[PDB]
């Protein structure tokens, strides 16, 4: 709970953990004024709202915060905001909403919605710190861009100041990955994109690398590498790709790529480096 | 088997008016053939046994040969005398009830017809109780109420936003925005036209990205071509036009790959005009001034003599400067400036305090308050050549600009065609983007009147609402043709009705529609009636008189009689007529709870309602359509929440408690 | 007895916003001081015990010394957060029910106030259930509905005619026509202003003839003065202005005899400005061109140097002609013309066939299609002087025109005064003619709210109707303050109400009124509700929350509930509140017949109706107001006559017979 | 029943005989299109309308045509027109209307109204004779002008094509004859008007004569002479005034006057001439 970008990310992944395939995000003025996330994933019952935000209701109902670590995250936002939330479960339920210690019913389809008036409401300082409107929107959009590429299968709609900016349509099994890829990365990247698919057993590399011969540093803004859902950064990976780029053409101009690796549980191993370098350089020639 | 009919005809300086009548049946009709040819076609169509005409009728070639020719006086074809006699016969004060109020050329013909008829028959003529228009374009018909109420282009009170236009106007060029708006006031019934646009919309859904940006650069070409014909065109109109031609080779390349017969047709219609492009690249500067008056329009390298005289004038700027520096530093007077005055000419200005230090090589030309201005031999001779060279260059620049019109006008026909083609692309590229972005589906057509919607949405309302819009299905056929809707205000009644009408309009312009699935039959006319009483009774009848089996009729909350139930008495009879006799596709919203008796009384009618929920401390409108009539009154709940003082509400609920202790 | 209150204040670049609240009572208010001074006045007026202000507040001079100063953060004064929190407290989704929707500068102040209040109190605050505006201009108040519904300037659907403006716009000059229209949107409550205009109207009723014609010649002086200040004024603007000053001595003479202090005041305000008149008579030609840019504006005899350079240029016309005749008849070539070309200069043109007969003297300057053009020494030297002399004369003509602005701007203040005086005369001369020609009477004012009409007429309706309007009386007082009206549609209900509101308006602008006799009290605000439901309930409350004892309230046919009698339940409570608590001058039209029970239940309320007459079964509306409630329902009779098919009507009356067999 | 001007005059005097003080005449397009005379004089009962235009009136619903010679005049118009008539008598009557054999009720104040669509409706000739719109209006206006000056006490309103042209305000007992006189004759006449009042017993001359010294032939259009309400023409009167004009100034330029003579019911006579000449010439000097 430091930038507005962070509050967006956590509530986006809260909905993802609930099996959500359509997450519609409406934001206004850097996120300060408004953050509305509506998700179609598993909803929340009437008893289960009350306590997630009331804080002395679990003194012996005891068992229901059990349901989520999302439920643990909601409370940290709501006590220090003008939070508003509506949800409807399973089927033939009514929708229910809460304000910040008061709850009542409402009308909604089976899902969840979460509205926020500029998080900090009792802190005079931590709001007066919050940076620009435009620049924070750019951080939010980056965060969503990174979640977007990891999960080609979830439809995400980003609108700013009312008017829609990003409509990321999901990709079905046996479907078009280009529709989504061009929408995220602009036409620019799509034009020089060369696919890469390398595999030696458990190691599976999927993704794209731009043709260095016509690549400019304007394409090179795009440098993402994910592993089993999330991007970590380690200097090992950094060299593997640049060696392949510098050895393909001696002119070492900035590379453009988006790549996903898939493996077994080890936090890191040497093979990790060599596997990648081999995959990239082959595709180029 | 035998038309044995009567007719009447007349002409003014606009066109020709027509009316027909039968006394064996009582059928009374009106029409207005727009041109000489259509008028000819309509005569033999009807093949009347007798034909009245005014002594003044000029186009005798149409009617000389016709059987039963009868010359009549002019004053009989008087519009107001006509209006007058007609109102008596029907027993009304206005012909609004018949929807032929704005057809005066025909009414002049029907006026003399009735005056003739009165005198000819003098038999029972109460069987002549009505008159309807024979509408030449039975494509789709819309009255004033429908045109403003749907909010196609004009919102209720005249403003522009919250219209269907405001949603779909994401067009890049103004000629395309205007074209879009024409398409909504004119849907047509030809299946060909509809399938063209649908197929085009589908093949372009993928190419949306590359196309839109290019079309914007074209600018308003349609209106620039007007100024070209008029010879008013300004420098900057030709610059955007030049840049528009730089787009054509690129658009050719983009549309080449798009696999679709309709698309490839418009691809050709676009045009090329590489000849005109070259001319303007050489003829005009990259970014020219607003007017030709002040020059700086025609480029260097375009004309020999232009650059020659400019070279003489262009030998000015650097000489004036050297003269200023030479003379300032020779003398050592820093307040020495070189400037110009239209009346006196060029001068050398020195401030008042330094004027006594001027070498008076300097002749005094002009005295000011705090400065003396001077002239020397070198400036005065140079003055003549610079100003007059500019003038010959500037005069020649106007000669050559008039010349540019003569060169471009030859392709004017083909440019009009290029302008219409580019505007149509902007429309269809736009509709493809809206269909994808707003998640619309293509509709399908059937042979008989009938509508089948699956999770249909309201395209305007769903956008303004930053919350969920509750989508609702619909199923109509010639057998299930009327739906009676009761329930709460702001319940979604008029909404559920109005969403269906927009869906139908969108289908009959060739676009995709906001729903999961759409099946729909033919629709000839759309009629509209919206609550509030001088007003109400008058226009309820328009719809009853004209509507057909194929028409769509949309009733909103009628029956504001002078008492409680006199107004209900009307609505019942009204409904029975539309359902039993006309058998049209009808949607009847009403607050009168008692009309929900009809389905048991009347076959082919069914009850629905907007269910709403009262709980906790408040009301939640589900906006969810359910079978069966509404449960109860919700009006008191409505009033409170909009923003009525609580004090008043107590007195109201008290009174309601009294009314429901009667029974 | 001392104020112990709380308040909030804020500023943007437009002005300063204000709000006040008490927690001991619950009184919640809003206002918007327009200027810095009025803001100061409002602070000491209220004398709050505590004062919230935004950290940004710039005008600290107003508030530094005030007791209980509290600095707060900016984001608290956010308009939308404010709107949001306020809607919760009242339990609504809109502040339209309170009539302060369009007071955002105050609402930003009330937003931080409530957010502060929420946290400070946390005690019982359901007694804060409302907010009303402290209206600075308690002269007369009108909302959007009143402004369009009366048809002051905008008829229902946006057109211009059938308005009150359309009746009285028989004004001669545009600045007067505009002034008339301002007066209708702004009546004021100062009796002096009203008696000025009435007295003026009476003394001018005889002199109407001589006066109107003269005022027209003034032209649109108001807007010409604008272009003068801007330095845009065109030649023909100054010509009409010149002619306007030629009217002043005449108007002085006509108004001299008119014996009335208000008239003699406007007589002086007019002005004289004989100085300005003389200048323009000498400075500009009788009929100048549209623009200065091509000359022919400044007269000969006005300037020495202008005429000098023109004499050199005027030595052209006669020399060109002699050259043409000399050379044509010396040679004997009849196709010899003398003409000009901007690019090449002057030339002597001979046709192709005669070009071979031209003398050796002629140098070829330009070759054409069927003619050779030549130049000789005599024309070429003369060419230089003529064109350059014109130029110096034309350049000087622009110098002198810019001069004419510098000379006139000094009396701009006095001209603004002359323009306002002339426009006001046109208004008052016009209203005198209407009052006489349309047979209006002057009204009289009283201390207490009350209206007494004698054979009052509807000023707009009476004129377009080419038959009799049925005039009707009216009597209201603080004791007889509500009239319940039932009866037929098109009965004259809304008419009898609307005529009264216009009468009140006309009284409070200072004009005569269409009636025999008019007595009337003070009236602070005018409110208006017209039928059709999101719509209806929302704005019924606006009127309930704001209205006062002195206000005029005009209810048309409310109560379109979701059922039959839930709508009646509302109207009963509504009526009781206006009559029993607010005790305003009220006129309640309703179709619900059951409300006619009130007079016997409620003191100070009385029944009236528009009686109508049925013979056989067709109907004559008497439009005649009578005491007691209406007789019956007339709605079925109404439907038929507007234009419904008779077939349907039978089925309706049958069904009505069924409803009244239930009891 | 020949010109439209004649149909106007008769229906105007019909209303005058019924004690009408306000006669509103509305006419459109020379009178062809519309002629509406509305009078506030005594009205007509329901049975009395029926038979004035349905002749067994004075047998079956009888001795009622007795009421008017206006009732004799209505019939001659109505059989040959699209006539429309509405009237309400005495008090608490309803208003009643007819077409010409069909009648029904209506709503009106105590008076009478008479509407006409271009008189001739079955006659092809007599209408095709009727000639101009504007020119016929001028004849009507003249006719009304002559009735106007005879009866200073009746308010008469003439409008053409909707818009009003003449609004002749009546003159009360003890009142201003100038308001009306200027409205009829324009300001022009009013400027040089010199009043005349001569009396030798039974002979009484009242009226106005213009100052010959500033009189032009533009003032001379106005030459009216009435006797007990109606203008007769006899050459005797013609000379009496011109002798006085020619003897006052030898330049015999056209005289301007409006004069009324008043006597006992005996048409005879030489004194008639000399009486007038004496009255005029005295006022001039
Ligand atoms: N006093 C009057 N005299 C003559 N004609 C009138 C008069 N009042 C109204 N009219 C006509 O009657 C029509 C409408 O009357 P109105 O007052 O609106 O009826 P209402 O009883 O208020 N109910 P509604 O019209 O159904 O809302 C107008 O078009 C007028 O032409
Ligand atoms: N299906 C829906 N989903 C969400 N909002 C809705 C829906 N239907 C209606 N609304 C909202 O309800 C408001 C008004 O409702 P409306 O349909 O006009 O009521 P109604 O029953 O037709 N009565 P009236 O308006 O008096 O004819 C609109 O401005 C919408 O904002």
* Strand percent estimate of chain A: 25-35%
State the oligomer: heterotetramer
How far do the termini of chain A sit from each other?
Answer: 47 Å
Bound ligand species: phosphoaminophosphonic acid-adenylate ester
Alpha-beta classification of chain A: alpha+beta
Which CATH first-tier class of the largest domain in chain A would you pick? Alpha Beta
- Any idea what the CATH superfamily of the largest domain in chain A is called? Histidine kinase-like ATPase, C-terminal domain
Number of helices of chain A: 8
User: In CATH terms, what is the fold-level topology of the largest domain in chain A?
Assistant: Heat Shock Protein 90
What is the CA-based Rg of chain A, rounded? Answer: 22 Å
Count of beta strands of chain B: 21
- Provide the spatial order of strands within the biggest beta sheet of chain A: 5-4-3-6-2-1-7-8
Strand content of chain B: 15-25%
Q: Any idea of the CATH topology of the largest domain in chain B?
A: Rossmann fold
Distance between the first and last residues' Cα of chain B: 61 Å
Family (chains A, D): Belongs to the DNA mismatch repair MutL/HexB family.
Organism (chains A, D): Escherichia coli (strain K12)
Protein name (chains A, D): DNA mismatch repair protein MutL
Protein name (chains B, C): DNA mismatch repair protein MutS
């Amino acid at each position: 709970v430091e930038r507005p970008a962070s509050v967006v990310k956590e509530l986006v992944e809260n909905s993802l953990d609930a099996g959500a395939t359509r997450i519609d995000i409406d934001i206004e003025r850097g996120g300060a004024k408004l953050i509305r996330i509506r998700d179609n994933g598993s909803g929340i019952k009437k008893d289960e709202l009350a306590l997630a935000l009331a804080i002395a209701s679990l003194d012996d109902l005891e068992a229901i915060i059990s349901l989520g670590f999302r439920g643990e995250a909601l409370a940290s936002i709501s006590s220090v905001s003008r939070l508003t939330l509506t949800s409807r479960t399973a089927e033939q339920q009514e929708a229910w909403q809460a304000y910040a210690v008061t709850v009542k019913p409402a009308a909604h389809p089976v899902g969840t919605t979460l509205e926020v008036l500029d998080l900090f409401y009792n802190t005079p300082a931590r709001r007066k710190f919050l940076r620009t409107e435009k620049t924070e929107f750019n951080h939010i959009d980056e965060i969503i861009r990174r979640i977007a590429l990891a999960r080609f299968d979830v439809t995400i709609n980003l609108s700013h100041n009312g008017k829609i900016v990003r409509q990321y349509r999901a990709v079905p099994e046996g479907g078009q990955k280009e529709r989504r890829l061009g929408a995220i990365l602009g036409t620019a990247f799509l034009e020089q994109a060369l696919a890469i698919e390398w595999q030696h057993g458990d190691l599976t590399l999927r993704g794209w690398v731009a043709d260095p011969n016509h690549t400019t540093p304007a394409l090179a803004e795009i440098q993402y590498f994910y592993v089993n859902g999330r991007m970590m950064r380690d200097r090992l990976i950094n060299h593997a790709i640049r060696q392949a780029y510098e050895d393909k053409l001696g002119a070492d101009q900035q590379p453009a790529f988006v790549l996903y690796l898939e493996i077994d549980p080890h936090q890191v191993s040497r093979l990790v480096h060599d596997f990648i370098y081999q995959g990239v350089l082959s595709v180029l020639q | 088997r035998q038309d044995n009919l009567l007719a009447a005809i007349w002409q003014d300086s606009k066109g020709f008016g027509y009316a027909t009548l039968d006394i064996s049946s009582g059928r009374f009709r009106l029409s207005e053939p727009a041109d000489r040819e259509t008028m000819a076609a309509e005569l033999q169509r009807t093949n009347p046994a007798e034909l009245l005409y005014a002594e003044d009728f000029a186009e005798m070639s149409l009617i000389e040969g016709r059987r039963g020719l009868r010359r009549r006086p002019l004053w009989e074809f008087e519009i107001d005398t006509a209006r007058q006699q007609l109102n008596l016969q029907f027993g009304t004060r206005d012909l609004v009830g018949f929807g032929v109020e704005n057809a005066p050329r025909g009414l002049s013909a029907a006026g003399a017809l009735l005056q003739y008829a009165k005198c000819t028959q003098r038999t029972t003529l109460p069987h002549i109780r009505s008159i309807t228009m024979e509408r030449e374009q039975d494509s789709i018909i819309m009255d004033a109420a429908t045109r403003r109420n749907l909010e196609i282009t004009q919102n209720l009170a005249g403003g522009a936003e919250n219209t269907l236009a405001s949603v779909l106007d994401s067009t890049v060029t103004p000629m395309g925005s205007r074209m879009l708006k024409r398409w909504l006031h004119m849907p047509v019934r030809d299946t060909r036209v509809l399938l063209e646009r649908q197929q085009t919309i589908g093949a372009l859904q993928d190419f949306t990205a590359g196309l839109q940006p290019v079309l914007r650069q074209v600018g308003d070409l349609e209106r620039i071509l007007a100024r070209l014909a008029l010879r008013t065109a300004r420098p900057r109109d030709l610059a955007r036009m030049r840049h528009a031609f730089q787009q054509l080779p690129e658009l050719r390349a983009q549309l080449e790959t798009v696999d679709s017969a309709p698309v490839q047709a418009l691809r050709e219609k676009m045009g090329e005009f590489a000849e005109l492009r070259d001319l303007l690249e050489r003829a005009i500067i990259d970014t020219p001034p607003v007017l030709v008056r002040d020059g700086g329009v025609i480029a260097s390298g375009y004309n020999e003599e232009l650059d020659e005289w400019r070279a003489l004038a262009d030998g000015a700027t650097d000489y004036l400067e050297r003269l200023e520096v030479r003379e300032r530093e020779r003398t050592g007077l820093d307040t020495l400036k070189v400037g110009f005055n239209a009346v006196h000419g060029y001068y050398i200005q020195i401030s008042r305090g330094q004027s006594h230090l001027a070498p008076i090589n300097y002749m005094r030309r002009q005295t000011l308050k705090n400065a003396e201005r001077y002239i020397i031999p070198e400036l005065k001779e140079y003055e003549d050549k610079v100003l007059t060279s500019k003038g010959k260059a500037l005069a020649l620049e106007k000669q050559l600009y008039e010349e540019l019109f003569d060169l471009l006008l030859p392709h004017l026909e083909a440019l009009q065609q290029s302008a219409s083609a580019l505007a149509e692309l902007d429309v269809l590229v736009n509709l493809a983007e809206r269909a994808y972005t707003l998640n619309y589906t293509s509709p399908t057509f059937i042979d008989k009147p009938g509508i089948r919607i699956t999770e249909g949405r309201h395209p305007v309302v769903e956008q303004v609402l930053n919350e969920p819009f509750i989508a609702n299905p619909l199923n109509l056929s010639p057998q299930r043709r009327m739906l009676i809707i009761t329930g709460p205000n702001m319940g979604g009644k008029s909404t559920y009705m109005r969403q269906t009408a927009l869906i139908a309009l969108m289908a009959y312009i060739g676009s995709y529609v906001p729903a999961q699935k759409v099946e729909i039959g033919p629709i000839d006319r759309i009629f509209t009636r919206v609550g509030a009483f001088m007003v109400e009774m008058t226009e309820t009848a328009n719809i009853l008189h004209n509507a057909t089996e194929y028409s769509l009729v949309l009733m909103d909350e009628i029956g504001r009689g002078t008492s409680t139930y006199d107004g209900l008495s009307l609505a019942w009879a009204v409904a029975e007529n539309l359902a039993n006799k006309i058998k049209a596709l009808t949607l009847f919203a009403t607050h009168y709870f008692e009309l929900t008796q009809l389905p048991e009384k009347m076959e082919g009618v069914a009850n629905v309602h907007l269910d709403a929920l009262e709980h906790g401390d408040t009301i939640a409108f589900m906006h969810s359509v359910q079978d069966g009539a509404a449960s109860k009154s919700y009006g008191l709940a409505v009033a409170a929440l909009a923003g009525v003082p609580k004090e008043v509400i107590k007195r109201a609920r008290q009174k309601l408690r009294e009314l429901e202790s009667i029974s």
